[PDB]
């Protein structure tokens, strides 16, 4: 209960209402009451991070077609 002059937003005053109820972290000149009273995840998306945090080769194509000397 702050007493004395109040820096929190009031009905009559105009132009100081910006971001009044928005919660802004840290030392706040604005009153706790007007602004209001644990993030564990990475919000942004990186395509590599988003997907998963077998061999493509020339040899792979046209398997059915080849005839010749087999290999292993």
């Amino acid at each position: 209960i702050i007493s004395g002059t109040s820096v929190d937003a009031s009905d009559l005053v105009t132009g100081n209402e910006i971001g009044e109820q928005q919660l802004i972290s840290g030392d706040a000149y604005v009153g706790a009451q007007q602004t209001g009273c644990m993030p564990t995840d990475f919000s942004i998306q990186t395509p590599a991070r988003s997907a998963q945090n077998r061999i493509t080769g020339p040899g792979m194509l046209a398997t059915g077609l080849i005839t010749g000397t087999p290999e292993f």
């Binding site: 009559l12 005053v13 105009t14």
Partner: protein
Amino acid sequence: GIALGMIETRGLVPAIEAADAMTKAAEVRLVGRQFVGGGYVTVLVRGETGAVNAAVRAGADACERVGDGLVAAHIIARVHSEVENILPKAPQ
């Protein structure tokens, strides 16, 4: 500071109450009193931001019920340099 508090009122008696309240509440400077016309008087103060918020909440409460009343009570934390030409630098 460069923040701007402005209190408009319907008369000079509600404006002088507001100027006294504002300039006693916080470390603000009275930069002007303007007679707009129609019975509208504006008292403009210039201080740091918190100072001007406090002053303009002190002025509004004071003059809300002195004379014909309070029209506006507005803080502009930074003013374009353009707007400074239309603003009073001293109260005479």
